[PDB]
């Protein structure tokens, strides 16, 4: 497995004596290798993204279920409180209505 | 008890807790035996009335009408071992599929639900026909009916992963 | 709102500008704003002043009232620009200044930091900008010039050859059909196994038992739908789901 | 003086320098405010400024002064706003939005735009074109793309651009005509930079000294990504349902830029896909299929951007590596003292 | 009813186990230490994702 | 080493399940030679026709040492298919939706987004190795709509994500 | 938004160490994996605290 990322110092001299037919063959071989690496990188990125999805989703579903339960209870008892506010508001509303209807009488 | 509950995964425990707390509106940690069957069905199970009454007698021995979360969990551990499979449901449908053509008439299936077995109410059958005969052609494809009743019940994440 | 109420809020803007001036130069020099905390509170005050003056100058139907408002709005905006530049100078040159702590302390949101765009920068020049855009488009069509590039797209690559595409579609479809055959065979094998188990146990699925199982499944499905709908209603009631807007 | 201003306008439109401004808004650049930027300065960490702060600063610097003639005469006169950042971070979107909101003429003197146009000595001519037209019909903005290449004087990198005329051809005339502007003229110069650190040594000074305000516009954070994703889908006319796993999508898309995700979403959302969005909302694996063919921004580019930020004068003074660069510091005094001490 | 912070004052002490040098120690203990670090990182990721949701 | 070992183990388990699915009789550990082509493709890979012929020839050669003609043994099938999967030849690995969409665009130069089912039938049956009419009808039952148009995008996505576990 | 520590240039190639074949890896390799796991755990903890505040 030769590391293509490290440019070998001296490879430019070899290209000076390369014939046109050999240059085309080398260019075709390099293009095929580059496309193979790109597709492998594309496959690796898709696999890594999917795995990073699943590991994140593995925590996500259970944690979200717990969160849904806990704040469901919390803002259930919160919604309990606002009923008393409705009761009081309607109490003064009906008192004011009774007072004003009496004035119209 | 602990041996039965050890078969439960933490995700299953959380799902059962959510289903219990949905009808545990007062937050006391118990649900009524009448809402007990509703909580049974919220998890994908399909208990009959006779089975519900039998398990109410089994667990709700004190007769207070309420069954708490640990008893809920042991009941789950007992009954998920015998969850009805889609193959069994399709085998049930092919009994009424007289012609074996893959579809059962809407009126015939309505009569089956309103006359044979645990009688379904007329409004329940109306909803059944509306959600099965989506195109309104008067024919119910029981295979797709089995598929969509099983959908939303048995771990749709598993179906997502099995692609 | 009511037009008299809008005039009232313009008056309130005037008193707020006066109070901001007085706070900048109070009778006691020790009470003058010295640190970034006081100066940033003053800056937020001018921000809201210019916000509501801008809204008023937009919405009043009175010509002379708006004409008077124009100078006030322009002066307040320019003053706030001066304050912004000066605070950036005193913030060791950082053009971006963080006010989340001050906003929380003063009980205001980060949306206050969003300086609004005045509408009169464009509305007052509606016909003139219309003519300018007409001239732009006339020159564009005369000279046949291409506009800005569209949103980029993943360059998937050139289509493959006809024969190669046919070949790979053939293998792909054969694989898909093989998978479908395997799934159908698995389903059939499960059915055969269950029926053979029933035959060995001597339990034949009667019409009554089939109806019981089917009705249990139907009850489960309908109850799941009703439970989901009632849970949705509880979500939107106790504050977990947005109610469908009418 | 013998050429009509309308003829200059027509020629500028014809040459692709003066173009119609698209109708976009600064709020199209989505994001969430930094909820502990101040806490990060408290903990002695210089945070990447929130995009909300970026919009606020850009508005106050450019849009509010340029909008009103009366304001621009007296407000702190800011002539140059520096927008440097990674690729597909929204520099072009912000420039177009600011230009449209200000209702200003748009003169594109980017080297790529001007390549092949007015070659040779006419590079000096285009500058007078644009400056006279801008002065006559203010408000007006002159836009430069890849401003790190205008001030470059290295021949190798200039030729590596593959340009028939070097990008530095507009440098001298740009510098000369820039000093002729005055407050109240409502003429602005805006540049967008992808690798502002490219200018080195002699070019670095001429680069940094020309822009007055240095705007650092970073990548969106987690909440900002959670805002950008549905916004990008809506921009490409797609929609994600309420049960979409937006949190996991944002976490796995950490490191992606707004424009890059916009390109990915454009690729993912086809007309048939939009038509079947009601039948099938977009799923995260469907997103990842396209995203695999998408390369994120390398850490080296972001680190180089951070080094250029640190080299920008404000936090350059912060980090104790340089004295405050006052404009009154005459160059040569530091060199003379060092060079005069070894001749005795 | 978010869980009270009377777990952190103990987990901070519990997470400070053996921050010393690993030079010259055995491959086996290296493997167990790698496993413990993997468990700690997984737990941190789990809690982070939990409270992030 | 451990990752190679459990990769081999999962490959072996997949191949064993595939063989058991097409087992002729429960516990007989035999698969018919005519059912071998489907079982080979059931392992999540789609080798070419030449590769399938090579696999069939190899299985016949291995079975020649046994007296079970027309049926393939579990051990031999496992060995062959697990060898092919373990060496991870690029021909076995499935293509992505990107390449599928690339190739499907060849027959629609106009970019209408759809391909004529009748013309695609003739192209498939006359180009490459001849496709059969039964599978042709099966595939146009899925890809061809009521108008005879093959919107190639969704079919490419299906051919990409049909059993593709990641 | 975890704080971008200056020095993470060498962690990019260390975070890609496979979790497999822990047995058979040399003492130096196991030390490197230990360091990688510690750094990843620290990053996750900082990220968690960022969401906390």
Swiss-Prot record, chain A:
Q: Tell me where in or outside the cell this protein is found.
A: Cytoplasm, Cytoskeleton, Flagellum basal body; Cell projection, Cilium, Flagellum; Cytoplasm, Cytoskeleton, Flagellum axoneme
| Superkingdom assignment | Eukaryota
- Biased composition range(s): Basic and acidic residues: 13-22
Q: Where does the record place Basic residues bias?
A: 1-12
Using the UniProt annotation, give all residue ranges assigned to the region (Disordered).
Answer: 1-22
Q: Spell out which residues are annotated as carrying Asymmetric dimethylarginine.
A: 96
Describe PTMs of this protein: Probably methylated by PRMT1.
Effect of a null allele: Defects in DRC2 give the ida6 and sup-pf5 phenotypes characterized by reduced swimming speed, disruption of the assembly of several other N-DRC subunits and destabilization of the assembly of several closely associated structures such as the inner dynein arms and the radial spokes.
Q: What does this protein do?
A: Component of the nexin-dynein regulatory complex (N-DRC), a key regulator of ciliary/flagellar motility which maintains the alignment and integrity of the distal axoneme and regulates microtubule sliding in motile axonemes. Plays a critical role in the assembly of N-DRC and also stabilizes the assembly of multiple inner dynein arms and radial spokes. Coassembles with DRC1 to form a central scaffold needed for assembly of the N-DRC and its attachment to the outer doublet microtubules.
What is the protein's quaternary organization?
A: Component of the nexin-dynein regulatory complex (N-DRC). Interacts with DRC4 and DRC5.
Provide the family line. Answer: Belongs to the DRC2 family.
Q: What is this protein called?
A: Dynein regulatory complex subunit 2
> According to the entry, what is the taxonomic lineage of the organism?
Eukaryota, Viridiplantae, Chlorophyta, core chlorophytes, Chlorophyceae
> Which region of the full protein is contained in this chain?
1 to 105 of 573
Swiss-Prot record, chains E, G:
Organism superkingdom: Eukaryota
What are the start and end residues of every segment in region (Disordered)?
1-24
Instruction: State the compartments where it is located.
Output: Cytoplasm, Cytoskeleton; Cytoplasm, Cytoskeleton, Flagellum axoneme; Cytoplasm, Cytoskeleton, Flagellum basal body
Q: Upon deletion of the gene, what happens?
A: Defects in DRC4 give the pf2 phenotype characterized by disruption of the assembly of several other N-DRC subunits and an altered waveform that results in slow swimming cells.
The record's subunit annotation is: Component of the nexin-dynein regulatory complex (N-DRC). Interacts with DRC1, DRC2 and DRC5.
What family is this? Belongs to the DRC4 family.
Record function comment: Component of the nexin-dynein regulatory complex (N-DRC), a key regulator of ciliary/flagellar motility which maintains the alignment and integrity of the distal axoneme and regulates microtubule sliding in motile axonemes. Plays an important role in the assembly of the N-DRC linker.
From the Swiss-Prot or TrEMBL record, give the protein name. Dynein regulatory complex subunit 4
Swiss-Prot record, chain F:
Presence of the UniProt keyword Cytoplasm in the record:
yes
Tell me where it resides: Cytoplasm, Cytoskeleton, Flagellum axoneme
Segments traversing the membrane: none
According to the entry, every stretch annotated as the EF-hand domain falls at 95-130
Keywords of the record, alphabetical order, are: Cell projection, Cilium, Cytoplasm, Cytoskeleton, Flagellum
Q: Does the entry feature the keyword Metal-binding, yes or no? A: no
This entry's Gene Ontology molecular function terms read: calcium ion binding
Q: What do the Gene Ontology cellular component annotations say?
A: axoneme; motile cilium; myosin II complex
Q: One matching Pfam family, short form?
A: EF-hand_7
PANTHER family attached here?
A: DYNEIN REGULATORY COMPLEX PROTEIN 8, MYOSIN LIGHT CHAIN 1, 3
Family, per entry: Belongs to the DRC8 family.
Q: What does this protein do?
A: Component of the nexin-dynein regulatory complex (N-DRC), a key regulator of ciliary/flagellar motility which maintains the alignment and integrity of the distal axoneme and regulates microtubule sliding in motile axonemes.
This protein's assembly is summarised as:
Component of the nexin-dynein regulatory complex (N-DRC).
| Protein name per UniProt | Dynein regulatory complex protein 8
Lineage, please? Eukaryota, Viridiplantae, Chlorophyta, core chlorophytes, Chlorophyceae
Q: Which gene encodes it?
A: DRC8
């Amino acid at each position: 497995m030769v590391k293509a990322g490290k440019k070998v110092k001296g490879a430019s001299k070899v290209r000076e004596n390369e014939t046109e037919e050999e240059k085309k063959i080398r260019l075709e071989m390099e293009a095929l290798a580059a496309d193979e690496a790109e597709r492998k990188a594309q496959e690796a990125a898709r696999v890594a993204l999917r795995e990073r999805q699943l590991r994140e989703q593995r925590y996500a579903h259970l944690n979200g279920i717990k969160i849904h339960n806990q704040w469901r209870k919390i803002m259930r008892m919160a919604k309990v409180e606002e009923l008393r506010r409705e009761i009081e508001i309607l109490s003064q509303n009906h008192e004011r209505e009774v007072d004003r209807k009496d004035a119209i009488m | 008890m602990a041996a039965n509950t050890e078969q439960l995964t933490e995700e299953q425990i959380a799902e059962f807790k959510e289903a219990f707390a949905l009808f545990d509106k007062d937050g006391d940690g118990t649900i009524t035996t009448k809402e007990l069957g509703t909580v049974m069905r919220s998890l994908g199970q399909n208990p009959t009335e006779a089975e519900l009454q039998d398990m109410i007698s089994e667990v709700d021995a004190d007769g207070n009408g309420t069954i708490d979360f640990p008893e809920f969990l042991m009941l789950m551990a007992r009954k998920m071992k015998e969850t009805d499979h889609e193959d069994e449901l399709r085998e049930a449908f092919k009994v009424f599929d007289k012609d074996g053509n893959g579809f059962i008439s809407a009126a015939e299936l309505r009569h089956v639900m309103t006359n044979l077995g645990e009688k379904l109410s007329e409004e329940e059958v109306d909803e059944m026909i509306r959600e099965a005969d989506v195109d309104g052609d008067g024919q119910v494809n029981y295979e797709e009916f089995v598929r969509m009743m099983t959908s939303g019940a048995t771990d749709d994440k598993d179906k997502k992963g099995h692609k | 709102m009511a037009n008299v109420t809008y005039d009232i809020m313009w008056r309130e803007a005037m008193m707020e500008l006066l109070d901001q001036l007085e706070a900048e130069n109070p009778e006691d020099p020790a009470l003058a704003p010295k640190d970034l905390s006081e100066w940033a509170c003053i800056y937020i005050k001018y921000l809201q002043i210019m916000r509501k003056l801008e809204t008023a100058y937009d919405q009043m139907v009175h010509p002379q009232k708006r004409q008077d408002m124009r100078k006030a709005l322009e002066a307040c905006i320019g003053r706030m620009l001066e304050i912004r530049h000066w605070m950036v100078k005193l913030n060791r040159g950082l053009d971006f200044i963080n006010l989340d702590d001050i906003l929380v302390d003063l009980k205001l949101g980060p949306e206050v930091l969003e300086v609004p765009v005045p509408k009169y920068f464009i509305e007052d020049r509606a016909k003139e900008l219309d003519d300018r855009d007409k001239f732009l488009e006339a020159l564009i069509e005369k000279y046949n010039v291409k506009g800005p590039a569209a949103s980029p797209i993943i360059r998937i690559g050139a289509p493959l050859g006809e024969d190669e595409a046919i070949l790979m579609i053939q293998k792909n479809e054969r694989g898909r059909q093989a998978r479908e055959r395997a799934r159908l065979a698995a389903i059939t094998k499960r059915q055969r196994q269950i029926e053979d188990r029933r035959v060995r146990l001597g339990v034949t699925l009667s019409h009554e038992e089939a109806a019981r199982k089917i009705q249990a499944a139907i009850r489960g499905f309908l109850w799941r739908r009703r439970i989901k709908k009632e849970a949705d209603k509880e979500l939107m009631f106790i504050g977990m789901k947005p109610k469908p807007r009418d | 003086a013998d050429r009509s201003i309308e003829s200059l306008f027509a020629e500028l439109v014809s040459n692709g320098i003066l173009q119609q401004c698209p109708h976009v808004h600064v709020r199209d650049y989505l994001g969430s405010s930094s909820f502990m930027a101040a806490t990060l300065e408290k903990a002695n960490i210089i945070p990447d400024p929130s995009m909300a702060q970026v919009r606020q600063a850009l508005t106050e610097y450019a849009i509010l002064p340029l909008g009103s003639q009366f304001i621009h005469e007296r407000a702190p006169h800011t002539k140059s706003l520096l927008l440097y950042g990674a690729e597909k971070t929204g520099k072009t979107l912000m420039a177009q939005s600011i230009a449209n909101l200000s209702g200003s003429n748009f003169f594109d003197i980017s080297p790529r735009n001007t390549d092949g146009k007015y070659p040779g000595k006419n590079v000096g001519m285009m500058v007078h074109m644009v400056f006279k037209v801008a002065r006559t019909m203010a408000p007006s903005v002159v836009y430069i793309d890849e401003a790190e290449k205008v001030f470059l004087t290295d021949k190798k990198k200039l030729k590596e651009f593959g340009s028939q005329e070097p990008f530095s051809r507009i440098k001298k005339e740009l510098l000369k005509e820039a000093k002729t502007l005055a407050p109240g003229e409502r003429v602005l110069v805006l540049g967008n930079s992808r690798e502002p650190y490219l200018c080195a040594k002699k070019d670095e000074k001429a680069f940094m000294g020309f822009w007055s305000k240095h705007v650092f516009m970073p990548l969106p954070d987690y909440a900002s990504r959670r805002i950008v994703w549905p916004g990008l889908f809506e921009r490409h006319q797609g929609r994600l349902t309420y049960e979409f796993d937006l949190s996991t999508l944002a976490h796995i898309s950490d490191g992606y830029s707004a424009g890059q995700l916009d390109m990915a979403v454009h690729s993912l959302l086809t007309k048939r896909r939009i038509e079947r969005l009601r039948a099938a909302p977009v799923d995260i694996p469907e997103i990842l299929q396209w995203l695999c063919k998408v390369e994120p921004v390398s850490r080296e580019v972001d680190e180089a951007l951070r080094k250029f930020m640190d080299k920008t004068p404000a936090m350059a003074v912060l980090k104790g590596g340089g004295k405050p660069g006052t404009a009154g510091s005459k160059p040569g005094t530091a060199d003379k003292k060092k060079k005069g001490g070894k001749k005795k | 009813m978010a869980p009270k912070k009377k777990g952190t004052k103990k987990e901070s002490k519990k997470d400070a186990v053996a921050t010393g040098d690993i030079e010259g120690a055995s491959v086996e203990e290296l493997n167990q230490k790698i496993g413990t670090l993997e468990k700690e990182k997984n737990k941190e990721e789990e809690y982070r994702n939990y409270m992030q949701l | 080493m451990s990752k190679l070992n459990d990769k081999h183990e999962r490959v072996r388990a997949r191949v064993r399940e595939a063989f058991i699915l097409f087992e002729h009789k429960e516990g007989s550990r035999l698969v018919d030679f005519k059912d071998v082509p489907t079982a080979v493709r059931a392992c999540g890979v789609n080798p070419t026709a030449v590769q399938m012929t090579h696999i069939l020839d190899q299985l016949a050669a291995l079975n020649a040492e046994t007296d079970a003609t027309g049926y393939v043994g579990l051990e031999n099938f496992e060995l062959v298919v697990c060898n092919f999967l373990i060496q991870q030849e690029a021909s076995l690995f499935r293509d992505d939706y990107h390449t599928l969409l690339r190739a499907f665009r060849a027959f629609d130069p106009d970019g209408r987004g759809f391909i004529d089912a009748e013309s695609f039938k003739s192209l498939l049956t006359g180009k490459g190795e001849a496709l059969s009419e039964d599978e042709l009808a099966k595939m146009m039952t899925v890809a061809a709509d009521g108008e005879g148009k093959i919107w190639y995008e969704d079919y490419a996505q299906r051919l990409a994500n049909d059993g593709r576990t990641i």
